[PDB]
Amino acid sequence: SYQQRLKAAVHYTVGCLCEEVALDKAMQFSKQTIAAISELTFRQCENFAKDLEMFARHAKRTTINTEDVKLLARRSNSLLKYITDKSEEIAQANLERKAQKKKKS
């Protein structure tokens, strides 16, 4: 079904990420651990999604934005720092978009 294939796609990506950690840390992950992380990640998306939608809704928006996500990642301070960094970078990638488009000025 639809969600089965979404789980498989998550498992694939989780496998790649865990492979990178494994190669970096020189310690193997069992196939079972990879599968467990994939399952947890899929399940965690349900909680993320509902919360994000409530945060957006809460501020009378239909589109979830960066502030909602940063709010979601509030829980560990190392995490919060990481995310904000990434956002400004992503915005910097956005500037390039302005450079691409022709400017009347």
């Binding site: 990420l17 310690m27 947890l40 995490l79 956002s87």
Partner: protein, 74 residues
């Protein structure tokens, strides 16, 4: 190497209660980054657990030992 934007979009839309809800591009980008951090934390914490109990590889037992705190952190 991490999540595609389109993948994360589909995963979230599976679960929205209100079908009206959409995802802005910047928000989607940050979520891609956040999910990577989640997965890498799980992996890295499992490796630390396996090391700590002197295991030859990161088995499910170690992962399970690392889940409680991971979940509180997210």
């Amino acid at each position: 190497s991490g999540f595609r934007k389109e993948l994360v979009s589909r995963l979230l839309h599976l679960h929205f209660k209100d079908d009206k809800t959409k995802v802005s591009g910047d928000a989607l980008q940050l979520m891609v980054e956040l999910l990577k951090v989640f997965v890498v934390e799980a992996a890295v914490r499992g490796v630390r657990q396996a090391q700590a109990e002197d295991a030859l590889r990161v088995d499910v037992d170690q992962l399970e030992k690392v889940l409680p705190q991971l979940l509180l952190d997210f």
